[PDB]
Amino acid sequence: MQGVVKVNSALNMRSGPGSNYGVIGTLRNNDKVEIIKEVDGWYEIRFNGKVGYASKSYITIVNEGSLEHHHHHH
Protein backbone atom coordinates (compact mmCIF):
# COMPACT_ATOMS: atom_id res chain seq x y z
CA MET A 1 0.00 0.00 0.00
CA GLN A 2 1.32 3.45 -0.95
CA GLY A 3 -0.50 6.77 -0.58
CA VAL A 4 0.22 9.77 -2.83
CA VAL A 5 -0.03 13.40 -1.69
CA LYS A 6 -1.35 15.87 -4.28
CA VAL A 7 -0.95 19.57 -3.48
CA ASN A 8 -0.29 22.68 -5.56
CA SER A 9 2.37 23.88 -3.09
CA ALA A 10 2.64 21.90 0.16
CA LEU A 11 0.32 20.03 2.55
CA ASN A 12 0.60 20.41 6.32
CA MET A 13 0.65 17.29 8.54
CA ARG A 14 -1.10 16.97 11.92
CA SER A 15 -0.55 14.71 14.96
CA GLY A 16 -4.30 14.14 15.35
CA PRO A 17 -7.08 13.72 12.72
CA GLY A 18 -8.31 17.32 12.76
CA SER A 19 -7.27 20.90 12.13
CA ASN A 20 -7.50 21.59 15.87
CA TYR A 21 -4.31 19.64 16.61
CA GLY A 22 -2.22 22.01 14.47
CA VAL A 23 0.61 21.54 11.96
CA ILE A 24 3.60 19.50 13.14
CA GLY A 25 5.39 19.40 9.79
CA THR A 26 5.18 20.25 6.08
CA LEU A 27 4.61 17.76 3.23
CA ARG A 28 5.59 18.30 -0.43
CA ASN A 29 3.72 17.22 -3.55
CA ASN A 30 4.41 13.83 -5.14
CA ASP A 31 5.59 12.61 -1.72
CA LYS A 32 5.18 8.86 -1.31
CA VAL A 33 4.05 7.81 2.18
CA GLU A 34 3.05 4.63 4.02
CA ILE A 35 -0.58 4.42 5.12
CA ILE A 36 -1.21 2.58 8.40
CA LYS A 37 -4.99 2.92 8.57
CA GLU A 38 -7.96 5.24 7.92
CA VAL A 39 -9.82 6.75 10.89
CA ASP A 40 -12.75 9.19 10.77
CA GLY A 41 -12.04 9.61 7.05
CA TRP A 42 -8.51 10.72 7.92
CA TYR A 43 -5.55 8.68 6.66
CA GLU A 44 -2.82 7.65 9.08
CA ILE A 45 0.62 8.08 7.51
CA ARG A 46 4.21 7.85 8.73
CA PHE A 47 7.05 10.20 7.67
CA ASN A 48 10.51 10.84 9.10
CA GLY A 49 9.75 8.37 11.90
CA LYS A 50 6.79 10.58 12.87
CA VAL A 51 3.11 9.58 12.97
CA GLY A 52 0.25 11.89 12.01
CA TYR A 53 -2.86 12.34 9.86
CA ALA A 54 -3.50 13.99 6.49
CA SER A 55 -6.59 15.26 4.67
CA LYS A 56 -8.23 12.80 2.29
CA SER A 57 -8.88 15.56 -0.25
CA TYR A 58 -5.15 16.02 -0.92
CA ILE A 59 -4.43 12.28 -0.50
CA THR A 60 -5.24 9.73 -3.22
CA ILE A 61 -5.25 5.98 -2.59
CA VAL A 62 -3.26 3.92 -5.10
CA ASN A 63 -4.72 0.65 -6.38
CA GLU A 64 -7.88 0.93 -4.29
CA GLY A 65 -8.72 -2.69 -5.10
CA SER A 66 -8.48 -1.89 -8.80
CA LEU A 67 -8.19 -4.71 -11.33
CA GLU A 68 -8.92 -2.99 -14.63
CA HIS A 69 -6.13 -3.37 -17.20
CA HIS A 70 -5.33 -1.38 -20.35
CA HIS A 71 -8.45 0.64 -19.53
CA HIS A 72 -9.36 3.50 -21.89
CA HIS A 73 -11.68 6.44 -21.24
CA HIS A 74 -14.20 7.29 -23.95
**Cβ–Cβ under 8 Å, residues 13 and 26:** yes
Give the determination technique.
NMR
**Exposed (0-12), middle (13-18) or buried (19+): which is 54, by Cβ within 10 Å?**
buried
Distance (Å, whole) CA 32 – CA 21: 23
**Exposed (0-12), middle (13-18) or buried (19+): which is 8, by Cβ within 10 Å?**
exposed
Long-range contacts of 17-24 (CB under 8 A, 24+ apart): 17/41, 17/42, 17/44, 17/53, 18/42, 18/53, 21/53, 24/50, 24/52
* Radius of gyration, alpha carbons of the chain: 13
The CATH superfamily assigned to 3-62 is: SH3 Domains (2.30.30.40)
Distance (Å, whole) CA 42 – CA 26: 17
